From Swiss-Prot, chain A:
Monoubiquitinated by FANCL during S phase and upon genotoxic stress. Deubiquitinated by USP1 as cells enter G2/M, or once DNA repair is completed. Monoubiquitination requires the FANCA-FANCB-FANCC-FANCE-FANCF-FANCG-FANCM complex. Ubiquitination is required for binding to chromatin, DNA repair, and normal cell cycle progression. Monoubiquitination is stimulated by DNA-binding. Phosphorylated in response to DNA damage by ATM and/or ATR. Phosphorylation of FANCI promotes ubiquitination of FANCD2, which prevents DNA release from the FANCI-FANCD2 complex. Transmembrane segments: none annotated. Signal peptide: none annotated. This is Fanconi anemia group I protein. Homodimer. Part of a FANCI-FANCD2 heterodimeric complex that binds and scans dsDNA for DNA damage. Interacts with FANCL. Interacts with MTMR15/FAN1. Interacts with POLN. Interacts with UBL5; the interaction promotes FANCI homodimerization. The chain holds residues 961 to 1298 of 1338 of the full protein. It comes from the Eukaryota.
Amino acid sequence: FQRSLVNQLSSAEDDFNSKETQLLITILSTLSKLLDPGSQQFLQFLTWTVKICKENALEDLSCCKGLLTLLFSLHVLYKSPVSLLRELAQDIHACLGDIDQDVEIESRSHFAIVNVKTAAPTVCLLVLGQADKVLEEVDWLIKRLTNQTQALEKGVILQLGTLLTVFHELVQTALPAGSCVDSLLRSLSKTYAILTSLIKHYIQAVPGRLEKLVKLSGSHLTPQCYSFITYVQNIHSESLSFATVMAKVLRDTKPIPNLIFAIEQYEKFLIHLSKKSKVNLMQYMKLSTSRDFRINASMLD
Amino acid sequence: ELISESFQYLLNFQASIPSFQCAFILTQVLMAISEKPMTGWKREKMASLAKQFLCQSWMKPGGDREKGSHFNSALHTLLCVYLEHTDNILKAIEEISSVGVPELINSAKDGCSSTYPTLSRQTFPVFFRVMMAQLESSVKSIPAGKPSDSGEVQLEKLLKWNIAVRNFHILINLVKVFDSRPVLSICLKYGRLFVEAFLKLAMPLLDHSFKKHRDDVQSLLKTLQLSTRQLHHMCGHSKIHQDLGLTNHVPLLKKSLEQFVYRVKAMLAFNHCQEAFWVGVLKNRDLQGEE
Amino acid sequence: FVVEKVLRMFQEIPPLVYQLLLLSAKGSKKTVLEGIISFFNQLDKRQKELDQLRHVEGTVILHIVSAINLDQDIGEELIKHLKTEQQKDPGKALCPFSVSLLLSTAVKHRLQEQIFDFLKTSITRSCKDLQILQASKFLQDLCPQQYDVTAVILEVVKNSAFGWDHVTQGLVDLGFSLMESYEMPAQQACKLGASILLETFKVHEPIRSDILEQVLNRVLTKAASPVSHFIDLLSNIVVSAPLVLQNSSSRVTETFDNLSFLPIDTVQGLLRAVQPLLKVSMSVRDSLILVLQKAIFSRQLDARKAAVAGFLLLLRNFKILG
């Protein structure tokens, strides 16, 4: 069955038959479950899928969604997927601009499937779902963490260390005003809650690895969230300019308070750890930033 | 008739009382004889008696004041029963906060206030806690904004909210002088409760009456902004100094203060005035200073 | 120090541990309970690489359950200790001896509902943990060990086939109660109850009639919800032992008397299961023919459909060759 898909992908734009490709991808997904994970055939199949996704470029949304879902379903059973998520985050960040508006970025196209047409809410929701699954995995593992302890902690810290880079890359993307922003904000609040839950264990039960993790979180993730919270104001204002308006505004602005609350909870427990261990962990994190508001009476008329 | 006669008989003893504790038990027994919810003239007499005891000065036979823990507990209960039964709670709170504290700080080097001799630098947190809690309870009692069912009732409701906001601003300004940790803890605990009460109750009123009245609403919000700014600065100070007792109240307070802004945006959007809204970053400032 | 030393100082075991049980009723029960449970755990582990050992185990658990019935205050501390062990370890401290002891105490209503609730929540947690672990290889690399509780709950069936009395009673009680608990991990629990009932029927030869009566009464209790899995269990239990149904007859007719009340296609399964009873006995055939005659002349369609559907099975069951 691989030959038909290879032939149809390489065909000219005049004749595509998107439904045929969709059915072929679904059949491949259904038949992939028979392979033994330890066999060499599984590795060959993974290599073929990665090669197909890297080389070819497609414009149909459903075909790209199916191919990426197939790739992740294979990749979870064989190894951790965070490296591919980092690569896709870098690719989508390169495809679209940046909120800074004074930075130039060029090329570095890891995957040809991701392009300006395909960087829509499709790939942004597809990536954030995988990130959510990884976070639920780490949440399960940390409750078990509460000679084996050192190995388990060394395993747990690497996942968050790699995931912070993915979120750092995605925070600096000028995304459209859709569900891709809401999912981003909710995942951000979730990961801050997970970091709080990690620190509470060390409260109950200092080492260099945790200090490095706290420094990375303070340097790379904390300052960028506030800049994103500033950018989304203008984004939502421009979106609402074109268009039950009160309900729409309330639904659009819902998750920001929860993000602020999560950040402050993490800060509070970090201070508790600092004063109960004689280490100045708060040196890494900068001061908070708060938003005021004003009314322009001149523009009311 | 029997209850009233006994009430008068016990109230006749108020002239000759040797110390604070006897008066405290006198108020307890007087309240015990009465009903659960007290009636008008008895309520007035109880308020008068409580104020009369509050305004007197108590000294031991060997001189010196009656500073102590039992004195603090008795003072707390007396303030509670006094404010529970006054005719107009906000008038009494405004009178105390605008008279007693300034005459303390301006003149009394080490003594007490002329109008309220019971008030002293040791007993100020008790007064602060009782006034703040009673203000929050009074604010929570106002009914919510009906869906544009009020003709001229909105004026009375706005007047009540304006008086409450002014009292809140006056009470917040006192924290600048007294920097004691209990004062900061009390204000951090109760500011969030006041703000969430304002969001739950007041905003439906401002939604349904922005068209008819405008200047009052903007003045009200502008007055509330000052107290919110000072709350942000206090939260920053508590986080910087790393006080475990104080940091426990920061997250919920910051969450509510962030909810306030977007609720105001929704209020503007309800009347198609969304173009006027604006958001910006507020410069950090330490207490009674800048930068 | 005394209990620690004598615990270190390990025929004469049942009287000795009875004396220690009395002393610990005077003293600390939790320490001696942990010591004896652990000691029997390494004994079983050594055996993993016996008849006298099983007899000793039965005798000592008999003394322990008798003492706990005499003094019920020890049970609360024992359950607290087991809860602490379950918190401290991922399903650890649940070995065949421990679960046998737990099942032995669940017959005299000494907080048996608490016992069943604890066992059910532990089983669901173990199954969910295994399900989560099977999904991802990243978890499997770090957390290789797994405490499957179904393995020990199946192993205690074989362990209890040497003549223990209270253990089998509690085991059957748990197996029955799991069916009502289940009402997806729930399907796993229902299959786990069916397997336990099948195994304990296959093992306990003297206890066939009690199981048959219990499942038959539960089958025809009330048609509140779908009970097709009970009918599957009925088929599985009756197909193994053909003559077992003949001994416990004359209750089948009572169930037949009200079969056409809530038929959800279970009547076909019930008839196919009890067909061996029908072919050998003529009285049951006459009673069933009477019920079918009552059904066919009924004036309502709902009973009529079940009547004719069972009638087809009756016609096809008996060969007409001669």
